[PDB]
Amino acid sequence: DPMVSKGEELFTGVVPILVELDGDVNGHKFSVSGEGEGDATYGKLTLKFICTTGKLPVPWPTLVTTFLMCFARYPDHMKQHDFFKSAMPEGYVQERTIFFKDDGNYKTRAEVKFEGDTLVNRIELKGIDFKEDGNILGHKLEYNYNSHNVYIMADKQKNGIKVNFKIRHNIEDGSVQLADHYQQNTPIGDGPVLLPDNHYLSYQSALSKDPNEKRDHMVLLEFVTAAGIT
């Protein structure tokens, strides 16, 4: 497939990644810089984020989904389903609203694209209507993360895709904070892009700390594989 080729070809090896986030949650302002690499052949991403403004005002787990679906491993049998890569290198806009149950919401807009050999994820985040002393602004979420399917469909009208999924964040009391994700991706460019049949990505994420790092930070390791189209 000569089309499913240019984009796909960009991910056959290890790709350097840069992530930049400008954040405002209930007027609490913050910036985050991320670096690492992705290897889509194995669905593997390795990232370190730093809050460059000081103390992050929300729990780092809450920002995992916001901080690279073009790095998912698509089985050869599902390569016609890979919207993310087919939009490269001109890239794609990923927008979300993330509804925290009985709390506030994030609204995000990201541009994901190549700048030379680096894959870059530039994000603006706004959060509103949070409780001061809720699970999020009041930092009650454990520093861990659960494995979750992510559901993908065509939005044949924005010439893009819609994505929905729920994240349950473990709270320090043994309970869970739900984060209900609604997502839309559209290509930046005018060229043909793959519009997939319904399928899902399986995600697993592992959070850690750099023992040598004194700034407020998160180390994230993610594995992601496309499925649900046997």
Side-chain angles (χ1 to χ4, degrees):
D1 203 304
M3 145 76 244
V4 95
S5 221
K6 169 230 305 86
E8 208 254 46
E9 200 159 47
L10 282 175
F11 294 86
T12 59
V14 178
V15 170
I17 308 158
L18 198 42
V19 179
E20 312 286 342
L21 178 148
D22 266 351
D24 180 339
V25 175
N26 281 32
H28 302 272
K29 282 179 189 203
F30 62 99
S31 308
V32 174
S33 298
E35 322 188 339
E37 75 195 13
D39 196 4
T41 297
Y42 313 90
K44 170 147 106 152
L45 287 89
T46 290
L47 289 181
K48 181 190 168 176
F49 305 95
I50 311 176
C51 177
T52 61
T53 46
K55 191 159 176 194
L56 191 71
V58 301
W60 280 106
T62 64
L63 306 175
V64 166
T65 53
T66 293
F67 292 141
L68 292 165
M69 296 183 173
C70 54
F71 287 103
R73 179 177 80 73
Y74 274 76
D76 179 82
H77 79 268
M78 284 179 71
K79 292 191 163 180
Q80 299 177 332
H81 299 311
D82 193 347
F83 167 85
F84 305 106
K85 287 188 191 69
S86 91
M88 298 291 181
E90 306 68 21
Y92 59 77
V93 173
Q94 183 154 297
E95 288 170 322
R96 297 221 181 87
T97 303
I98 300 176
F99 291 103
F100 294 92
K101 195 70 173 304
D102 303 312
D103 209 337
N105 69 74
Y106 295 161
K107 279 176 220 141
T108 68
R109 186 182 164 104
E111 287 195 10
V112 177
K113 81 181 199 213
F114 282 86
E115 295 282 350
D117 292 327
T118 304
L119 186 286
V120 181
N121 182 16
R122 297 176 203 208
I123 313 146
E124 321 172 68
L125 183 147
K126 253 69 141 288
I128 66 177
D129 263 281
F130 286 84
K131 295 158 187 191
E132 298 319 311
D133 58 52
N135 295 329
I136 293 98
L137 284 183
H139 297 273
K140 310 171 196 216
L141 308 177
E142 297 175 343
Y143 193 79
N144 43 39
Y145 210 91
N146 296 310
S147 307
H148 285 109
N149 298 157
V150 165
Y151 303 94
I152 305 171
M153 52 175 71
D155 175 352
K156 260 169 208 174
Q157 353 188 187
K158 297 211 157 220
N159 173 47
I161 54 148
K162 291 168 322 183
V163 176
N164 160 266
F165 60 94
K166 277 175 158 66
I167 290 300
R168 272 127 227 110
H169 296 286
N170 290 12
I171 314 178
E172 105 196 275
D173 73 8
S175 188
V176 281
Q177 174 62 68
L178 294 195
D180 225 274
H181 286 65
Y182 291 85
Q183 173 184 341
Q184 258 171 330
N185 295 55
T186 61
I188 290 160
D190 190 36
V193 294
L194 293 182
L195 285 214
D197 288 356
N198 305 351
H199 64 286
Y200 66 92
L201 306 179
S202 333
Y203 273 83
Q204 286 89 226
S205 302
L207 322 186
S208 62
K209 301 294 195 183
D210 175 347
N212 298 313
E213 179 59 70
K214 302 275 163 166
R215 291 168 292 173
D216 191 2
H217 77 285
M218 165 171 71
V219 177
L220 170 68
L221 160 69
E222 275 194 3
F223 283 105
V224 184
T225 311
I229 278 168
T230 46

